[PDB]
Amino acid sequence: KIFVGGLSVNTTVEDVKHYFEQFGKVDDAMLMFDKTTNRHRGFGFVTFESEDIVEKVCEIHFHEINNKMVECKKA
Fold first, then answer.
1. Using CA atoms, how far apart are residues 44 and 59, in angstroms rounded to an integer?
2. Which residues form the RRM domain?
3. Residue 63, CB half-sphere, CA atoms under 13 Å: how many?
4. Read out DSSP for 56-73?
5. Which of 39, 13, 40 has the alpha carbon at shortest distance from 26?
6. Which of 6, 9, 14, 50 has the largest CB neighbor count within 10 A?
């Protein structure tokens, strides 16, 4: 599975899941938002047997999630 952080607020798994889904089967695409107002950050946990995508999408750092440069890494 891969990992992600920076998931702004209003952001929801449906966001990463649909995002990396086009990047890798992403059979699962979870997301962790900060507690109550802990929207300042948030790390999600996706997973697409397509490591190839996790290979690159995991490097870089400024990803585009719905509207955030969040960072992605092949967890």
1. 16
2. 1-75
3. 26
4. HHTSSS---SSS---EEE
5. 13
6. 6
Experimental method reported for this structure? NMR
What does the CA dihedral 44, 49, 52, 53 come to, rounded to 10 degrees?
-30
Measured CA to CA, the distance from residue 48 to residue 20 in angstroms comes to: 8
Transcribe 34-53 into DSSP letters.
-SSSTTS-BEEEEE-S-HHH
CB 5 within 8 A of CB 70: yes
Report angle CA 1, 68, 44 to the nearest 5 degrees. 25
